[PDB]
């Protein structure tokens, strides 16, 4: 039963600050990133696509370009961590992570900006 979990389902962030939101997925110690797919989206806008062990920035939505990045050092630990720098008011909303690593699941995280 592949399950994605979230340490927090809501983040309150200050304007101009940096934000890192996380989704956790099961790792079996012999991690193969060629089988892992990580997808982050906010209101139908593509943020991250980590496929075939590579971040495909060719599909990144305009606002999230050069501000959004997946922390690849955390993937081996079973953590899909999306870092968004210089947070704007338009970054407030519902985010979703869709992870596939054998099975597949998804979780929603809300972000509020002050």
């Amino acid at each position: 039963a592949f399950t994605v979990t979230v340490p927090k389902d809501l983040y309150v962030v200050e304007y101009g600050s940096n934000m890192t939101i996380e989704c956790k997925f099961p790792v079996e110690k012999q991690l193969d990133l060629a089988a892992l797919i990580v997808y982050w989206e906010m209101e139908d806008k593509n943020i991250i696509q980590f496929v075939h062990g590579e971040e495909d920035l060719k599909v990144q939505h305009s606002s999230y370009r050069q501000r959004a990045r997946l922390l690849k050092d955390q993937l081996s630990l079973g953590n899909a961590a999306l870092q968004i720098t210089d947070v704007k008011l338009q970054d407030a909303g519902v985010y979703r992570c869709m992870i596939s690593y054998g099975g597949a699941d998804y979780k929603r995280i809300t972000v509020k900006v002050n």
Epitope: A1, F2, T3, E28, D32, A34, A35, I37, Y39, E41, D44, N46, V51, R96, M98, S100, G102, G103, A104, D105, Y106
Partner: antibody, heavy 116, light 112 residues
């Protein structure tokens, strides 16, 4: 290049048994979950069974539970479907499919005909 | 009886958009952020067109796009060509995250 070659199909009498095999190549077989998806002549796709990369976890559609067994050999890169107690309703083309977010690669299928 | 529901057929003139809808019968079978779409030509095996509701695999034409809204997933084909005539199937991961379900398929007709 990724290749999935199914074999083992043919005519089986009702209540009989058959084993299908799928030889995979062009990818690290043990890193991906694999599935068997079938399609009755002229009808739609039906998911049959899935197995994890290591072979430690197997999943079945309710229509084939207790009759079909999925297995894999991660040294010969081969996927199997052992079918027992076959029924006329199991007549279909059986596809071997690689799971990677979705079925990104499919074999060309093997026809299984259950008839007296 | 397929767990997912799509139209039996869709018809349309060439050089035009066309959308096929996918929907479920419960939450345990249909999860829109994990919807895949497949194209199947006569006598051929299915081909992955869209995965994760809107993601396009390498090799798939930019004329094929997918979207989701509420408890619905859609496949849109822009600039219809004659070669697009095929059966299209939607699929979703089940509630467990291990099994799968398929829609009953949609036969696409290019009317020109």
């Amino acid at each position: 290049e990724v290749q999935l070659l199914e074999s083992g199909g043919g005519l089986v009498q009702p209540g009989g048994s058959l084993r299908l095999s799928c030889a995979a190549s062009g990818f690290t077989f043990s890193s991906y979950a694999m599935s068997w998806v079938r399609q009755a002549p002229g009808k739609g796709l039906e998911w049959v069974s899935a197995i994890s990369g290591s072979g430690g976890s197997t999943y079945y559609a309710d229509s084939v539970k207790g009759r079909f067994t999925i297995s894999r050999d991660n040294s010969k890169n081969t996927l199997y479907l052992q079918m027992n107690s076959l029924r006329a309703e199991d007549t279909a083309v059986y596809y071997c499919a690689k799971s990677y977010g979705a079925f990104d690669y499919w074999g060309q299928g093997t026809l299984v005909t259950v008839s007296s | 009886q397929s767990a997912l529901t799509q139209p039996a057929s869709v018809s349309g003139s060439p050089g035009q958009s066309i959308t096929i809808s996918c929907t479920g019968t419960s939450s345990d079978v249909f999860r829109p952020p994990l919807v895949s779409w497949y194209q199947q030509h006569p006598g051929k095996a299915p081909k992955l067109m869209i995965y994760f509701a809107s993601l396009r695999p390498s090799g798939v034409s930019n004329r094929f796009s997918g979207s989701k809204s509420g408890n619905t997933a859609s496949l849109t084909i822009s600039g219809l060509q004659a070669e697009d005539e095929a059966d299209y199937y939607c699929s979703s991961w089940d509630h467990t995250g291990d099994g799968h379900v398929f829609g009953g398929g949609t036969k696409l007709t290019v009317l020109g």
